[PDB]
Design a protein around this motif. Structure first.
Motif, mmCIF file in Angstrom:
data_model
loop_
_atom_site.group_PDB
_atom_site.id
_atom_site.type_symbol
_atom_site.label_atom_id
_atom_site.label_comp_id
_atom_site.label_asym_id
_atom_site.label_seq_id
_atom_site.Cartn_x
_atom_site.Cartn_y
_atom_site.Cartn_z
ATOM 1 N N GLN A 185 2.542 4.649 -2.364
ATOM 2 C CA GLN A 185 1.143 3.960 -2.800
ATOM 3 C C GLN A 185 -0.322 5.338 -2.429
ATOM 4 N N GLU B 76 5.429 7.048 -7.152
ATOM 5 C CA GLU B 76 6.812 5.833 -6.207
ATOM 6 C C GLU B 76 7.165 6.788 -6.084
ATOM 7 N N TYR C 220 10.224 -9.226 -3.918
ATOM 8 C CA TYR C 220 9.584 -7.687 -3.506
ATOM 9 C C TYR C 220 10.880 -6.456 -3.569
ATOM 10 N N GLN D 285 4.171 -2.082 2.891
ATOM 11 C CA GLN D 285 4.607 -1.118 2.655
ATOM 12 C C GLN D 285 3.691 -0.182 3.480
ATOM 13 N N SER E 18 -2.342 -5.797 -1.535
ATOM 14 C CA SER E 18 -1.414 -5.185 -2.602
ATOM 15 C C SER E 18 0.000 -5.566 -3.036
ATOM 16 N N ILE E 19 0.359 -5.672 -3.484
ATOM 17 C CA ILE E 19 2.026 -5.712 -3.711
ATOM 18 C C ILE E 19 2.447 -4.529 -4.037
ATOM 19 N N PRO E 20 3.059 -3.359 -3.775
ATOM 20 C CA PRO E 20 3.747 -2.307 -3.946
ATOM 21 C C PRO E 20 4.868 -2.547 -5.229
ATOM 22 N N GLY E 21 5.079 -1.039 -5.857
ATOM 23 C CA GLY E 21 6.439 -1.369 -6.818
ATOM 24 C C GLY E 21 5.011 -1.718 -8.266
ATOM 25 N N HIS E 22 5.981 -2.284 -9.607
ATOM 26 C CA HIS E 22 5.087 -2.357 -10.345
ATOM 27 C C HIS E 22 5.933 -3.743 -10.446
#
Lengths: 391, 391, 267
Positions: free
Chosen positions: B78, B83, A294, A40, A264-268
């Protein structure tokens, strides 16, 4: 009131973000070579957030190809804690906006010739490759030697010396010769130009006005001949150069694996290695999802699907039943119909690119009964059923 | 690893950002009604940063008109610490993307019918008006009364009751009647619907599926008849409703004056009330600039110009010599030629709008010898000189 | 040789010169005055006529010699090895620096010859006039010479009594020059043109299908379809300026009227 300093921080910098991006087509048709989202966050955001980390908060950006995508996202730069201005490289004719790139060095000359702006050491760096160099160290490195120009060098394998411009330095760390794409035997060193230069305002004099002018092929040969303090720095730093489309496919997966660490990686993390967006319409019981994956928000994964990581599935997608996604990168608004098996593929709107560079136009092949834009209300049926509708 | 809560914060919300924006045309031709920059920060960013201030970090956004402008700037969210997912309201035909708005209430129904997402009290608010309400207080206000729906009301003058939908409440603060644009005598109260509702997930049942459906004209009449716990809140809060184009012209100046307090001003204050961008090409000695004025970066103000605040001059502009800017709003890439006097005007690309709503097409009037896009290398000369070139 | 500049060099002489010299690459050079070193790339040669240094558009102080690269090269097939495959690569800025550093038999020749470099639009306007004057010698002028310096195309509808034509002028075929016009050479008027009465063309280059209406005075201009370029580079868009009551395509059957008549038709 008060008329305070305009000094702010006085550490200035410039990202080069005017390139057409012909090596990344068909992605660069609608998105420039910066703004290309790593998951993202765009590539350029990494550079801006890095220049901010090192006090370079007065940022100049030159734009040409798909300028509106760059200037809409960053704008003046309040939200990134920096200041950003834009030098547009082109000219209008017949109401339409034509891109006319001035070159890596020529775009800098336009900025200074417009108004004298670079007044102390400035960092310039291509905005099509995310980096994590410790700037306040490299900029401090050419200060004690008094360099007018400094190239930061990464060490590539002995075989990949034919992809970049080669930098040759003596024992003074002084650059003496260049080599644009030489063979493995032809190359003299294995130190490459990473497009991360640190210049002193005086170098802009050697660049001619009202001319397109490149850094590595014109300005840097100019600097070697005249015997200027031209120096080179090296040592390990994360450098993700998205050269061609498959390199972007590799980078997204690398972040999903962990072979790229700082990103970093988005979402949780819904499940270990499975990051979901917001409001993902999925029935986890009746699907086979194998991390790391993802899934963007508002994406529907119908029962009986198969997603095998490392795989990115952009937001607002639809994975129909009986679909098999194996190690793919899916962009936003994609509809994978039933009985499709994508392995090592990148889907971008209407284009399907494999890991070798082959690009398929899904619309011009009537294949949108298999991979189409998810926003069609017409459930597009197959030539098998087109037959049985009349025949 | 661990499978933790998806609860995150569990306070969900939704911005309505799918409107065509017909009341703000010609600005809404290329920029939606959100994303309209107040100086530099877009209107929607204010709302997102407000929902974050109050713990509403799980944001849903419905988009239709100019969707790509909204989804490119915010994306998953982010960088805003929230979100964000997008519900697109439309359908494709002949490869082109057609906008098909579902209504203020219908767009919510599409989200829940797609996948059940709203599960506890949710705030919905139109994304075309920046606000500063204390949310964690209004949301806590319908909790003790058990309201299924709550309208927050602003008090407008007795004369402006004909612009909004009127809300009538008894002594229980219970809504009993509505009034869409009634005259000053016709109106029963002076409490207006501000488009800031706080709903309990159960209200989405009263909205029909697969139907366009509005909140104030369909759902709210539906709620009054069936006698639902429909309540109304009020009290002072900053509410900037950009109704028509002149209202946006007023808002930018109001921020420059200070009559709008909570909004920040970009750049740094070079002189008291005079905020400059980055690398503003100006000769302060030979110009007459009267604050408050904002000048975007890479803007050239030629010697002998006159800028009288409150005036915004967007980035990458060119104010030729002998030009007079009096109380105007100038957008990016504008070229004000010599001998032009703009007073109480808003210039947007090729359009010139005055304080009453009149819109002039500068291109279709051959007036681009006076106000043109700054990116033309052809210095466009006047019909006087077009004569003397041949005649 | 670059195909954007007409030349009259005797090739079988320069190619035979590096053939006897054994050059792998040879640049043909023209000798310009001491001032014009800032427009073209300067070539420095030793006494073997071997290229030793280059200078891309340097001023009079930077320039060391007065021999310029005219874009007329004579190559041996071995020089194509120094060019990489599947790569964009220029001759003068990359290959020729490659040749000087590697110490190849890279030579430079200098011969007197007519060299017309059409750089920008005014250079083409100057070149067409030069051919009409005779300051460009080797180029012939088409049509047949009706009067000394007056070259007509085929079936030019003109009534020579009632016109003011001062040579040298070329008039393309099927062009009508109405009585009372003024064409002052050196002027080219392309085929299928229409010079209305009372028009004045002074030292201009007119392309095909042009209609110069009454009360026009063009001096040092180049008209190409819908564009009007002067001798300095200024370009006027005739369509976006409503000027087709004065200069339009000759194929219009609608006689385009002036803001004077557009007024008096209504108002």
């Amino acid at each position: 009131s008060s008329g305070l300093v305009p000094r702010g921080s006085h550490m200035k910098a410039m990202i080069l973000a005017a390139g057409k991006g012909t090596r990344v087509r068909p992605i660069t048709y609608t998105i420039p070579k910066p703004m290309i989202p790593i998951l993202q966050k765009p590539v350029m955001e990494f550079l801006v957030e890095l220049l901010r980390q090192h006090g370079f908060n007065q940022i100049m950006v030159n734009v040409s190809h798909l300028a509106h995508e760059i200037e809409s996202y960053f704008q003046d730069g309040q939200r990134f804690g920096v200041e950003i201005a834009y030098s547009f490289e082109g000219y209008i004719k017949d109401g339409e906006l034509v891109g006319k790139a001035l070159g890596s060095a020529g775009g800098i000359k336009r900025i200074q010739d417009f108004n004298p702006f670079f007044d102390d050491t400035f960092v310039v760096l291509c905005g099509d490759a995310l980096i994590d160099l410790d700037l306040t160290a490299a900029v401090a490195w050419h200060r004690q030697k008094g360099a007018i120009a400094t190239v930061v060098m990464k060490t590539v394998p002995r075989e990949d010396v034919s992809s970049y411009g080669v930098v040759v330095t003596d024992k003074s760390d002084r650059i003496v010769a260049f080599q644009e794409k030489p063979s493995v035997e032809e190359a003299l060193s294995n130190h490459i130009n990473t497009g991360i230069y640190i210049f002193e305002p005086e170098v802009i004099d050697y660049i001619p006005s009202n001319q397109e002018y490149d850094i590595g092929s014109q300005l840097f040969p100019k600097l070697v001949e005249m015997g200027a303090p031209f120096y080179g720095l090296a040592m390990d730093f994360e450098w993700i150069d998205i050269g061609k489309v498959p390199d972007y496919w590799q980078a997204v997966r690398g972040v999903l694996n962990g072979t790229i660490k700082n990103v970093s990686i988005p979402g949780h993390e819904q499940f270990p290695g499975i990051y979901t967006g917001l409001n993902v319409a999925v029935n986890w019981d009746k699907v086979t999802i194998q991390g790391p994956v993802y899934i963007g928000g508002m994406t529907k994964i119908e029962d009986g699907a198969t997603i095998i990581g490392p795989t990115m599935i952009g937001p607002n997608c639809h994975i129909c039943s009986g679909a098999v996604v194996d190690n793919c990168v899916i962009f936003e608004y994609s509809r994978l119909g039933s009985d499709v098996r994508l392995v090592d593929k990148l889907v971008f709107g209407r284009y399907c690119v494999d890991k070798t560079g082959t690009t398929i136009d899904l619309k011009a092949a009537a294949l949108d009964w298999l991979i189409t834009d998810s926003r069609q209300t017409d459930i597009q049926l197959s030539p098998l059923e087109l037959k049985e509708m009349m025949s």
